[model samples]
Target: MPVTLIKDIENQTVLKDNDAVFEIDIKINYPEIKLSWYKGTEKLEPSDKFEISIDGDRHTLRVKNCQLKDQGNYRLVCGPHIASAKLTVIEPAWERHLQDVTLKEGQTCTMTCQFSVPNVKSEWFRNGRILKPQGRHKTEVEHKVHKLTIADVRAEDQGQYTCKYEDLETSAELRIEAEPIQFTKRIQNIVVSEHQSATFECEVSFDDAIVTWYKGPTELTESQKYNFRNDGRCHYMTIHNVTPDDEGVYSVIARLEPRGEARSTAELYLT
Candidate 1:
């Protein structure tokens, strides 16, 4: 008479970037029974992303690379019997976890992490408690990456920090110490012809310390006349297309708060 659902469709949950398959077993009375699958009343077309197959009385719907939009109710219509199931898709919360940070007291500390899904609601915690965004404490989410910053961090700010999204979370420790940093290699005086570039560079003991470049008595900013570059422990200040007026003393100060200071001064001579 009518098609009988021998085994009902079961709900399935899968992570994003994986595949999800829903299968149903049916007993048909007639040899010719039209079977169709629909997603929220819309019929599913057979394609590369969505594979639909019928093997005898076994009907299957396979979704490749499951995404958040693919999570919904699916219906299979066989003769007069209808079987329904739900698909739950979850995005892997942590693509990149938080990393431990160590910095000098009285300096800003920034911790960053990344997730697979963008614009998701994420939270920040300190020492197992919810961290409120207040004062110098700030939180930001740019696309899939999230950041937590504590401006002018004190010794008390040293603790465990966490970033949480849904049921997934990652944590790292923050250590504050007063460490002495000095220049391992100092910038040397150099002479270059007019219209040529001159570069002054120095290497410091700490890789993450803040560096300030100065020419004569004025602080230098990134501009057409000057360029700044840093690679781990080495910091560079380049004078692009220098002129006769560019001949002066150049200084690079690498320092961290609470007395971690290293200074190197050299002269740039123009021919």
Candidate 2:
């Protein structure tokens, strides 16, 4: 008889910093068949925390009070065949706290990044670039707080500053634009005549930004008479062989997925 195959095993889930029960279900064609289970990278073993059981053609391997290191890929082997499933551990969202800071030229300013998770790593960034300690600057990580201290503040250090945590995958940015930086539509107007080539400008500021153009709610792609160019500070959207119907509120949205920051500019007017 051909070797019977088993399926229906799914991924395992565990909780971080806690004991968890991990289980997998396997189906076999023959009730009299002998089967074995093993983790992908390890040999099969029987212990108090790990054990296997079978009822009829169904088999299960259960791990009691699983730990973080126990969270990984697992496999079920029967005869000459094998199947595998990935294991994942769930963690609560890490929280961060920072104190309000004030800085004066020729004076020192300090900012802190704190997180609830223990042994989490933190980093500091200025205008999307990692901030490293130089002559008068210093960066340090203590527990969950990443502190950045500038011995003497300068005009160049007056833009936006962000503190990020790797384990939490979260960030907060503060812009020190003293004067009102009016948020204005980068593409104030777009005009396209029938069968004429027209271009629209998308103007927005972002960190690690990606600009995408859309007609109403739908994205403009290769099939559309539109394309874009990154002109250092702005994204230029150009339309070829324009039609009257193509003239409407064309929205340009600039987004940074990692930081969850986005800005939108729009103007759709056609002649």
Candidate 3:
């Protein structure tokens, strides 16, 4: 008797109009095994949409430009062994707000949060709290725009509003505050000494900013001598067995949310 096990299925949910690649690791006790794939109960063949390839103990099935109709149950059967995974194709959600539209200080400003996702339920929230339907505000869902109209917008409406999709469990937030004329550069601390271990902090305002550290003009790579830790807002990079060559300008470049504004160039020097 040959025992088989399937390991590590990627992507429970995939975006529509994108390629869906299914990979699985197969362990078989037998010397030779045949792998077969099926869409629903029908066996898959070499068509424009379906393609399968095998490499030793690993098998991959790639479906090109998956549509909503293509989403369903899938199965991979190999030499009397069966493994199954579900595929769901969803529309990409586009959630964003109007950027810095000026309104009279006391007058109402209509801040919009728009998003679109197929086969998913959408909801609007203000600062993490769900927005309930009320007389002062109106809620409308039309395919993508889960619009919340504010009759009289105040300075209090200057925070973050998040748009979340139920099926995908994905959310995007936007800030409705007034834009600043000039953005100020903030300093992040880096602690390192000559011949001793030191730490470098990379801080950014945006949640999705990629933080990188550079020594002088040379970029730092991940190696045994360096350690990186991220706590959402800031990243702490530690350098062990420090040397004089390790001391120089360490920068934390970041892109701001909504606008995708980028700012960089922070320095750290050691004595």
Candidate 4:
């Protein structure tokens, strides 16, 4: 062999929009020798993307701002010596990472992200369990943007979630808050003598929550006999000049802002 390859080209794995360089060192027996580079069976040329440079005994081939089409095996031929290497191009999996989301129960949640490759299929997982596109789980891909939407999310849907595309993955957490409407303190049974005043007090989850009071299926209103008061989370209903006629089952219903409700009841006895 007139040309001896001292160092062969090295393989490289580079991300998209990055540069990949291949270099080789050779010793020539003749003063002048021809050298050429080939990608598979197609010969390469010096241009904007493929940059060919030579310095002393070193020969180099540079691929600038590589893409998916730039991945292949590159071969260098000098006289009777040949050196080959492979180039692998990978896409940027997480251009925009998935962020943690916190929402109330029955609300819709959507997790969005960006990728270097467009229209790629992505899979979603929760707590290491793979999820399919059905029921409340939905997937959408628009250009380089991918989205995973969960409609009417519940506590069972809350966990660490991951979005996988190709061989790369990104993860985030999902937090679901329970309903705010709750009864903190339920009304207890009361005993009062005839002509004595009777009062009922209860507490709710929120301080400004409004509740409706009822006496044996009839809603109570503010009057001389029935008085209503609200202070913070506590609610009070006072009945003046209590008698056997005022003895009955008193109940309160607290309605949630968007959905659901809570109820509590107690009995009033006259002695």
- Looking at model 1, residue 92 earns an lDDT score of 76
Q: Highest lDDT: which candidate?
A: 1
Please provide, for model 1 over 1-271, each residue's C-alpha lDDT reduced to its tens digit, 9 standing for 90 to 100.
Answer: 6787778789999888899999998877887877788998689988978899888778889999999998889888888888789999977779899999999878899999999878888999999999999999999999999999999888789899999998899899999876578899999998999889898988988787689999889999999989899889888888989887888888888986654698899999987
Model 3 ranges with Cα > 4 A deviation:
6-11, 93-105, 108-110, 117-271
Model 3 whole-model lDDT (C-alpha atoms): 0.64
Local distance difference test, per candidate? 0.88, 0.63, 0.64, 0.87
Residue-level lDDT of model 2, residues 157-252, one tens digit each, is 665566666444444443232221222346766666688877876554442357777878888875466766776556677888877777777776
Best by TM-score: 4
* All-Cα superposition RMSD per candidate: 17.1, 22.8, 26.4, 10.4
Tens digit per residue, CA lDDT, model 4, 152-203: 9987788988989868998899998878678899999999988888999999
Candidate 3: minimum summed lDDT over ten consecutive residues — where?
A: 174-183
lDDT winner between candidates 1 and 2: 1
TM of each candidate vs. truth? 0.40, 0.35, 0.39, 0.66
- Candidate 2 vs candidate 4, lDDT winner: 4
Clashing pairs in model 2? none
- Candidate 1: which stretches are off by over 4 Å? 94-172, 176-271
The true-structure Cα RMSD of candidate 2 reads: 22.8
What is the TM-score of candidate 4?
0.66
Tell me the tens digit of each residue's lDDT in model 3 across 1-271. 5755657455557788888888888876776767778887888876888888878678888888899898887887777778788888877656554344545434554545556553346676767788776866666766655565666665566555555665433343333443322223344555556667677665565454565666666777778887877676666677887786665566554554433444455555566
lDDT of 3 at 111: 49
Clashes of each: 0, 0, 1, 0
Error of 1 at 217 (Å): 37
